[PDB]
Amino acid sequence: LIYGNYLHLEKVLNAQELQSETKGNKIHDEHLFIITHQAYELWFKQILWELDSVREIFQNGHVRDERNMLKVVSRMHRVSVILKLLVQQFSILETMTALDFNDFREYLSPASGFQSLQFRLLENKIGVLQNMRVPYNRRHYRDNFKGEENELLLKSEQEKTLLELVEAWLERTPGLEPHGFNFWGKLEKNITRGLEEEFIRIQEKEEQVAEFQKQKEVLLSLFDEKRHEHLLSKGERRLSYRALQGALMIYFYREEPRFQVPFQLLTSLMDIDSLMTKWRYNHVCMVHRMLGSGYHYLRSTVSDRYKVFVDLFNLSTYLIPRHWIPKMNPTIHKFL
Amino acid sequence: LIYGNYLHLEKVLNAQELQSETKGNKIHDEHLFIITHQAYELWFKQILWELDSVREIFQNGHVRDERNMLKVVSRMHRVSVILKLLVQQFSILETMTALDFNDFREYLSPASGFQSLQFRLLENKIGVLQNMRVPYNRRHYRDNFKGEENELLLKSEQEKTLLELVEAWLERTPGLEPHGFNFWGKLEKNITRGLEEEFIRIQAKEESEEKEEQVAEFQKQKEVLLSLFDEKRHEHLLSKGERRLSYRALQGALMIYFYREEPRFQVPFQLLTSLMDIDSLMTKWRYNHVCMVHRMLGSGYHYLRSTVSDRYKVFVDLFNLSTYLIPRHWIPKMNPTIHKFL
Amino acid sequence: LIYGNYLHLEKVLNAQELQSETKGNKIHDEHLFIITHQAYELWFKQILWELDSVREIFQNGHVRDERNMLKVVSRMHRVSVILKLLVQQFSILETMTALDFNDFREYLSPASGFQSLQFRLLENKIGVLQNMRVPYNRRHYRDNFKGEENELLLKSEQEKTLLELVEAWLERTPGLEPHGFNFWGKLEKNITRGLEEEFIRIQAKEESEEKEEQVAEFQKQKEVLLSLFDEKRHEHLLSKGERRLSYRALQGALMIYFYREEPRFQVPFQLLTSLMDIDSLMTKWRYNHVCMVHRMLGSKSGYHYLRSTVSDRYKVFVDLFNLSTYLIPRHWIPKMNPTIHKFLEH
Amino acid sequence: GLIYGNYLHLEKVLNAQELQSETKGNKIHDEHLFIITHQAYELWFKQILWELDSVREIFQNGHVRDERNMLKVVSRMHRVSVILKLLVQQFSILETMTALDFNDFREYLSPASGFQSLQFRLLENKIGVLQNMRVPYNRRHYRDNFKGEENELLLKSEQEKTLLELVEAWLERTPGLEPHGFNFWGKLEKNITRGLEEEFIRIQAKEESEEKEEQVAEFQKQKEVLLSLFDEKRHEHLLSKGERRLSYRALQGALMIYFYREEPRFQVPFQLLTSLMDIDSLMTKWRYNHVCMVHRMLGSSGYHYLRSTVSDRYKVFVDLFNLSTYLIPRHWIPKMNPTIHKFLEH
Ligand code: HEM
Ligand code: HEM
Ligand code: HEM
Ligand code: HEM
Ligand SMILES: c1ccc2c(-c3ccc4nnn(CCN5CCNCC5)c4c3)c[nH]c2c1
Ligand SMILES: c1ccc2c(-c3ccc4nnn(CCN5CCNCC5)c4c3)c[nH]c2c1
Ligand SMILES: c1ccc2c(-c3ccc4nnn(CCN5CCNCC5)c4c3)c[nH]c2c1
Ligand SMILES: c1ccc2c(-c3ccc4nnn(CCN5CCNCC5)c4c3)c[nH]c2c1
Ligand SMILES: C[C@](N)(Cc1c[nH]c2ccccc12)C(=O)O
Ligand SMILES: C[C@](N)(Cc1c[nH]c2ccccc12)C(=O)O
Ligand SMILES: C[C@](N)(Cc1c[nH]c2ccccc12)C(=O)O
Ligand SMILES: C[C@](N)(Cc1c[nH]c2ccccc12)C(=O)O
């Protein structure tokens, strides 16, 4: 009916209990600490809601109908806009001094952010691998959770992640067919050709040739399926070789109509990874200003180990001159 | 003590019920609409908490001890940092299209943002006067409220506002005493002299339109500057609600502006700055809200546009002191002679 | 090639002369005032560069190849990202107090922001109409300029605006053909039918305040929705400048709104969204500028003229916003269906 | 008289954009954005140098001794942090350039590099980045990328008093440290020693349990930390390794201001300390955002050097952050009753 009832403000606005006050020593700034976290958690719930809806669109086959790509990209863009706000939101907690935090910090133990169910659900559903987590005090992340919460966390690890669902979709990208546009075949040939030409051309001058060799190494390593499988097992890469080919197809042919919105999707996945890392960085800096080894553990989380779509960033390494890219003639254009 | 229990997430995260889904027609974006408003309301509660603490510091006399000024200005600064975030937060709801909003809008009636208790408490506690409010549907804002909420709103109108508490503190500003530094007396004299000196320079300037323009400016400025010493004009503008602060409080504020670098006035000057910031940010919030209603409902909108005005700027008198700026050399000299009182 | 030479820093970083210092009374904050404006002007030059490139893609027919829509939308999105930064940039100038501004203001006369060539070029190229400009002190804007600057401004007024180039492209939107999908014909019929059905339902209620309230709302809605099919009212509102797009372009825009998820319309829909964003951000820039003039100069005028610029009179793509007025239940939208689906499948 | 464009020297600022891609007959649209973005960074670096130089001068010439000048000091330092915040947000503009599009004009840039930003180096030096602390790139000194007057300017920047040194000297003179006066350090050592003793008694009184044992463990850690503060030799040692930067006495002054921040004479000094930390944090955020962007454009040498810059070795006021380590219960802080308080009253 009424605003307050529709938003269940009877719950939202009766959820602030200062432990400092419960123990007979109310500290003003504890209220800000509570509200800040409650606001983070409301937005985490919203991100989960968007992300779960996008996972469902992939898992139920709806993504196959390309009419649904706009909704997919809008919701992923919305996740990024929320994360941007969450990064800015640290500026509020920076109005609390370490001295004032020090007056109520004692009443917090043994509570910790490590116990944020939703933050973990979000990491898992995007596709952070448990085996790839940095241990804190030689402990498992789920050790802090019990009951239905531990159950929910397990489901989040076992259900298909955003990374896995995107991977599957990337594997079906049009153009990879050897009997068709044969993208991979043509790309290998064109680059090999071009490098040899560069070889002849070059045949400080000499160190320029030295640089050429480095590029040759990098570019050719792309066609090494085994090296990929090895790096996959480590966890230094995350996407299947075939998904990687699909992604590169979308990068190079981004302007082709069928690939325009898919390209935007890839861009937004990278954005989410970057913003997640920015959130972790801002959080680290705050612990440092307040507590003066959590700080070092948190710093370790600011790493490629926690970047789920690292493969999408790394495709910049394999940029080539435009004229080496297999031409998409109107003859072939039809499929795109 | 576990995170979720300390933050009472059992309440906060079980407070999201889509009306579209309750009526068997779940619309995805209704969830965003709910969360966005819940986040606004959490932050309004935080602003009320800071603002109530500052009101108390004034009302109970603690502000008299100047050691408390840092805390006062930090909390007022913190309110403006929150408001800045609340302005940016509109960007989230701008990811909802009007078409998608149109799919669940029917399930909202009869709820409205108009019915935000906390938003009204915030306006009232800052110092929005009821008699100065633009009518909605040719009726008073409080009619949209009933029961304990209507009663709380009345208390919020009758209890001392931030404007009134700052006013009383401004009235006691050191320097105004006729038997002391006699700021107002000296300021009137120095401006009178300064204007005269200016006139002499102007009349000598060769007959020309440029001179003519300078003459025009001089007359305008003369009018403005001298009008400052007209206590009757002030009382008149107070009754029409075009000004808000007592004449004496205005004198205190101007004292702080001109002598802001003097140690006792440094943090008071920051307080005045922060009060203006809060007014400006409140206005920016109202502007962004208007633009969004327009993008969703098309061309309520007109009432909201009417709220974007000086009628809702409680500390308008602090902004308007820019009108009465004079060259630095006209400002009464303090000097070591009478420097140590500040 | 050195950084400083590539960026011509010998020019950029030797362009700061304080007039207060030239007249023997250096005021520290004047430096901030100079740099802030120089930074605004660099970004205005960048906006003109993006906007000119997009205008050209339309004017030369490149937009007809839908491969170029990604570039169009990325550049329009980039303009909005810049404008958002320019709005935030006011926060720097708010660290200057009015008292400190008052110490060097005298040395500025008779220079004014009104003399920003690039800001005028930007307004003109987007599509602000001269007739719809608020007069300042009963004077025309362009007489503040002379020589080549006056000439550049005239070209900007006479060349095709972004609004006109988008209009032309909207007129060619697939689906409007009476002998084809016949969007307009089907939309008129569906809404007429829908309204009739609605009326019957309400008519069948018992006489009450509630019934009459519903009747009243129905009549309001009916008038709005049906007014859309009145080409003559549209022509009339065009001449008063309350609308800007041709009737046919309006039909194209509504086609893109309703069928946004169809593949050929996905990126076009994003373009329309970005055009609305640019108008909103331009207006936000104007609003933040007004608030600052007030904080520095006080009320009384400049403040009042600038406030008048914050109005729909300066919103070029007002017709895109106002399509929210004509939202209808989803089930009244003519079905696209596989039958004709392909015409919007790339 | 004076016209906007002349006042701002726009004839220089807006004729400073030459695309190397275009000079070599292969114009690439996005190179223009690359140029403008850097030019805008450089304008704001010039503004930060202007504010920072003015504040350095206020310290170096003794003006800071008159506490009337503290408001101007804190406003200008706050203004530096508001600019830096904008500079961090400004990366969002260059993120609208894709790596593919950057790849089309990158070849025309060699051998120019950001490393060659005079102003960025001047800024690092004037704040107080010490040369010995700098990470070498390709086993070279940073200044060897510079020649002529530029090399000379950089040398002056290294030799003149840094903000770190000027703040250090001012912190050493903080009221309250005098053994013959309030004797802050003497009283603080005694109160902490007493407090630790009291704490030990409380814990040892607890009933045998692991929690007690944990509290014992915590106590022993905290005791060592807090008492290590009174070890001037440990401080000298940490200074040599560059893990601390401030003199022992300056550290005492800083802690005095932290604990007595509400006392009137220390209110604005406390804000100054806060602002110095803000600048360091924002400088490191700038370096972080720059790293992330190099990676997204070039992929994963430079990247690793730049990552090494995102470190406490480039935080000049790291000591101000680290004072959080030495927080004690409020009741242990030496009492300042109005009697003694008199010395800290305007
Ligand atoms: C006073 C401000 C803050 C302090 C001092 C602080 C402190 C800490 C510390 C020390 C840790 C490491 C785990 C531990 O030892 O308990 C941590 C982790 C965490 N904090 Fe915070 N925190 C603060 C603000 C926040 C905020 C606003 C959030 C928002 C929800 C948050 C969420 C988290 C999360 C999710 C973790 C786990 C991080 C991970 O495992 O990757 N913290 N925090
Ligand atoms: C789709 C987004 C929104 C729409 C369409 C919307 C619409 C409206 C409308 C039409 C009114 C005028 C009263 C009425 O006739 O119902 C109004 C007022 C109001 N809205 Fe919103 N609103 C939106 C978002 C928000 C948000 C996010 C807030 C955050 C709390 C909010 C707070 C308010 C407040 C407090 C009022 C009363 C303002 C006053 O009297 O000055 N609205 N809104
Ligand atoms: C201290 C800050 C500022 C003051 C006091 C100020 C004052 C004014 C005034 C009074 C006008 C009206 C014309 C006149 O009477 O001379 C004006 C217009 C203008 N100002 Fe500013 N201004 C400020 C900052 C800026 C900045 C940062 C920009 C950025 C480019 C700017 C750009 C303009 C423009 C373009 C106009 C013409 C606007 C229009 O006609 O729509 N000003 N300003
Ligand atoms: C596509 C954008 C950019 C790329 C690819 C890039 C690349 C690089 C690289 C590779 C370096 C290491 C030095 C070298 O190997 O040449 C560097 C350093 C630097 N860049 Fe950038 N940069 C970018 C944008 C910017 C911008 C916008 C600024 C603003 C002025 C900037 C300022 C600098 C500075 C000052 C350094 C030296 C930093 C230090 O030594 O700590 N760069 N950049
Ligand atoms: C909710 C409640 C607390 C937090 C914290 C947080 C930040 C700093 C802390 N220092 N001590 N504690 C409590 C003790 N716990 C468990 C034992 N040692 C590690 C931390 C803190 C808690 C951050 N976010 C929160 C949300
Ligand atoms: C919570 C619930 C609703 C809202 C609204 C909001 C926005 C647009 C609306 N259109 N109709 N309604 C409901 C009816 N009200 C009252 C009676 N007629 C005027 C509008 C809307 C509600 C904004 N914020 C909300 C928070
Ligand atoms: C460049 C140069 C000046 C400005 C201004 C600006 C702002 C406030 C002013 N008050 N007086 N003046 C000078 C005189 N002008 C023109 C003639 N009479 C009306 C005001 C001001 C100039 C804003 N942006 C600028 C950029
Ligand atoms: C001005 C000019 C160039 C830049 C760069 C920048 C960024 C990436 C680059 N990749 N190659 N180059 C050119 C070669 N330089 C110098 C010699 N070898 C190391 C890299 C680049 C230049 C960033 N900001 C700039 C401003
Ligand atoms: C039919 C298909 N949508 C094919 C597909 C997969 N990945 C893509 C990327 C861009 C464009 C198309 C695709 C599917 O099976 O999902
Ligand atoms: C002792 C006093 N705090 C004086 C006072 C009032 N307003 C001020 C403004 C600035 C500086 C001081 C004051 C009081 O009576 O509150
Ligand atoms: C061939 C065409 N590009 C068709 C066209 C015009 N407007 C559109 C809007 C959405 C989709 C397509 C169009 C042209 O005539 O430009
Ligand atoms: C007289 C003095 N301004 C004293 C001083 C030094 N550092 C301070 C920090 C806070 C407060 C005062 C000081 C000076 O010697 O500069």
Short mmCIF file of C-alpha atoms in Angstrom, two decimals, chain B residues 23-199:
data_model
loop_
_atom_site.label_atom_id
_atom_site.label_comp_id
_atom_site.label_asym_id
_atom_site.label_seq_id
_atom_site.Cartn_x
_atom_site.Cartn_y
_atom_site.Cartn_z
CA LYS B 23 0.10 -10.21 -8.12
CA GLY B 24 1.47 -13.06 -10.30
CA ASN B 25 3.36 -10.96 -12.92
CA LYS B 26 6.98 -10.55 -11.73
CA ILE B 27 8.84 -7.71 -13.46
CA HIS B 28 12.64 -7.94 -13.17
CA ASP B 29 13.38 -4.21 -12.75
CA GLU B 30 10.99 -3.72 -9.82
CA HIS B 31 13.75 -5.21 -7.64
CA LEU B 32 16.10 -2.33 -8.55
CA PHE B 33 13.39 0.19 -7.77
CA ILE B 34 12.97 -1.26 -4.27
CA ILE B 35 16.67 -1.51 -3.46
CA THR B 36 17.45 1.99 -4.73
CA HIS B 37 14.83 3.52 -2.40
CA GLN B 38 15.91 1.35 0.54
CA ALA B 39 19.47 2.60 0.07
CA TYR B 40 18.25 6.24 -0.05
CA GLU B 41 16.35 5.62 3.21
CA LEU B 42 19.37 4.07 5.00
CA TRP B 43 21.38 7.18 4.08
CA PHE B 44 18.58 9.53 5.11
CA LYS B 45 18.63 7.80 8.51
CA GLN B 46 22.40 8.42 8.70
CA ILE B 47 21.93 12.09 7.78
CA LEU B 48 19.25 12.48 10.47
CA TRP B 49 21.64 10.88 12.96
CA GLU B 50 24.43 13.35 12.18
CA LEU B 51 22.09 16.34 11.99
CA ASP B 52 20.32 15.47 15.27
CA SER B 53 23.72 15.16 16.98
CA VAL B 54 24.71 18.62 15.73
CA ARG B 55 21.38 20.16 16.73
CA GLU B 56 21.93 18.77 20.25
CA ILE B 57 25.46 20.24 20.50
CA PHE B 58 23.98 23.68 19.79
CA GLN B 59 20.83 23.36 21.87
CA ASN B 60 22.56 22.09 25.02
CA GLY B 61 25.25 24.79 24.97
CA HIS B 62 28.22 22.49 24.15
CA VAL B 63 28.99 24.57 21.04
CA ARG B 64 29.95 27.40 23.42
CA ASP B 65 33.15 25.46 24.12
CA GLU B 66 35.09 26.02 20.88
CA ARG B 67 36.82 22.64 21.27
CA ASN B 68 33.60 21.14 19.86
CA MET B 69 33.79 22.98 16.52
CA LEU B 70 35.91 20.32 14.79
CA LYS B 71 33.30 17.62 15.50
CA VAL B 72 30.51 19.95 14.35
CA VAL B 73 32.20 20.73 11.04
CA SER B 74 33.29 17.09 10.49
CA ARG B 75 29.70 15.86 10.88
CA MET B 76 28.32 18.62 8.63
CA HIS B 77 31.02 17.80 6.07
CA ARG B 78 30.06 14.13 6.37
CA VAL B 79 26.41 15.03 5.57
CA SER B 80 27.54 16.72 2.36
CA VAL B 81 29.71 13.70 1.40
CA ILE B 82 26.65 11.44 1.85
CA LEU B 83 24.46 13.81 -0.20
CA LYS B 84 27.07 13.77 -2.95
CA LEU B 85 26.80 10.01 -3.06
CA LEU B 86 22.96 10.23 -3.09
CA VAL B 87 23.16 12.53 -6.15
CA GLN B 88 25.44 10.02 -7.94
CA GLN B 89 23.08 7.20 -6.96
CA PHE B 90 20.51 8.45 -9.49
CA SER B 91 22.82 7.05 -12.19
CA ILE B 92 21.77 3.56 -11.06
CA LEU B 93 18.07 4.17 -11.60
CA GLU B 94 18.86 5.72 -14.98
CA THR B 95 19.77 2.17 -16.15
CA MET B 96 15.99 1.46 -15.96
CA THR B 97 14.13 2.46 -19.14
CA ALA B 98 10.72 4.14 -19.08
CA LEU B 99 9.25 1.13 -20.94
CA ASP B 100 10.48 -1.27 -18.23
CA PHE B 101 9.26 1.01 -15.45
CA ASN B 102 5.91 1.10 -17.28
CA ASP B 103 5.56 -2.67 -16.78
CA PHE B 104 5.27 -2.51 -12.98
CA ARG B 105 4.16 1.11 -12.34
CA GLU B 106 0.51 -0.02 -11.93
CA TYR B 107 1.40 -2.14 -8.87
CA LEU B 108 2.77 0.85 -6.92
CA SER B 109 -0.39 2.88 -6.16
CA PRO B 110 -1.06 4.24 -3.69
CA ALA B 111 2.59 4.51 -2.59
CA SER B 112 4.66 7.60 -3.41
CA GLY B 113 8.08 9.02 -2.50
CA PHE B 114 6.07 11.99 -1.22
CA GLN B 115 5.40 9.69 1.71
CA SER B 116 9.05 9.48 2.82
CA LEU B 117 8.79 10.35 6.52
CA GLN B 118 12.56 10.71 6.75
CA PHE B 119 12.84 13.11 3.80
CA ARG B 120 10.31 15.39 5.47
CA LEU B 121 12.01 15.10 8.87
CA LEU B 122 15.26 16.12 7.16
CA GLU B 123 13.70 19.17 5.44
CA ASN B 124 12.04 20.27 8.70
CA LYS B 125 15.10 19.73 10.94
CA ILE B 126 17.31 21.75 8.55
CA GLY B 127 14.71 24.53 8.63
CA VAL B 128 12.24 24.44 5.72
CA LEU B 129 9.27 26.52 6.92
CA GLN B 130 5.85 24.96 6.42
CA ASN B 131 4.26 28.28 5.41
CA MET B 132 6.94 28.64 2.70
CA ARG B 133 6.32 25.23 1.08
CA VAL B 134 4.79 24.90 -2.37
CA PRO B 135 1.35 23.24 -2.00
CA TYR B 136 0.82 19.79 -3.51
CA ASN B 137 -2.63 19.35 -5.04
CA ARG B 138 -3.58 22.71 -3.41
CA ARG B 139 -3.03 21.13 0.02
CA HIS B 140 -0.42 20.95 2.77
CA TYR B 141 2.35 18.34 2.67
CA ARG B 142 1.49 16.92 6.12
CA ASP B 143 -1.99 15.79 4.98
CA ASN B 144 -0.24 12.87 3.21
CA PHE B 145 0.70 11.56 6.66
CA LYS B 146 -1.40 10.12 9.49
CA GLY B 147 -1.12 8.84 13.08
CA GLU B 148 2.25 8.85 14.92
CA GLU B 149 4.00 9.88 11.69
CA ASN B 150 1.87 13.06 11.46
CA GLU B 151 2.73 13.75 15.12
CA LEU B 152 6.47 13.19 14.60
CA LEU B 153 6.34 15.62 11.65
CA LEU B 154 4.73 18.28 13.83
CA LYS B 155 7.41 17.88 16.53
CA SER B 156 10.00 18.24 13.77
CA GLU B 157 8.42 21.59 12.77
CA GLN B 158 8.11 22.87 16.37
CA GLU B 159 11.50 21.72 17.74
CA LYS B 160 14.45 24.04 17.14
CA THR B 161 15.79 23.76 13.57
CA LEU B 162 19.43 23.85 12.50
CA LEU B 163 18.75 27.32 11.05
CA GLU B 164 17.45 28.63 14.41
CA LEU B 165 20.30 27.07 16.42
CA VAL B 166 22.96 28.48 14.05
CA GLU B 167 21.15 31.85 14.13
CA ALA B 168 21.35 32.02 17.94
CA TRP B 169 25.07 31.10 17.82
CA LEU B 170 25.72 33.71 15.09
CA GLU B 171 24.09 36.39 17.29
CA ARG B 172 26.81 35.82 19.94
CA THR B 173 29.71 36.19 17.48
CA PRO B 174 32.61 38.19 19.07
CA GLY B 175 33.28 41.61 17.48
CA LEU B 176 29.72 43.02 17.16
CA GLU B 177 29.85 44.87 20.50
CA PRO B 178 29.49 48.68 19.95
CA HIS B 179 31.64 49.15 23.07
CA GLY B 180 34.22 46.72 21.58
CA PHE B 181 35.56 46.24 18.05
CA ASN B 182 32.24 47.77 16.92
CA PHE B 183 32.35 45.92 13.57
CA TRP B 184 29.01 47.22 12.20
CA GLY B 185 29.76 50.85 13.08
CA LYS B 186 33.21 50.73 11.49
CA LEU B 187 31.94 48.88 8.40
CA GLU B 188 29.23 51.49 7.70
CA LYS B 189 31.79 54.32 7.99
CA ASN B 190 34.42 52.58 5.82
CA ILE B 191 31.92 51.78 3.04
CA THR B 192 30.53 55.33 3.09
CA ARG B 193 34.06 56.71 2.78
CA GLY B 194 34.99 54.14 0.11
CA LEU B 195 31.96 54.98 -2.03
CA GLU B 196 32.78 58.70 -1.75
CA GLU B 197 36.38 58.05 -2.81
CA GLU B 198 35.08 56.00 -5.74
CA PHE B 199 32.74 58.80 -6.81
#
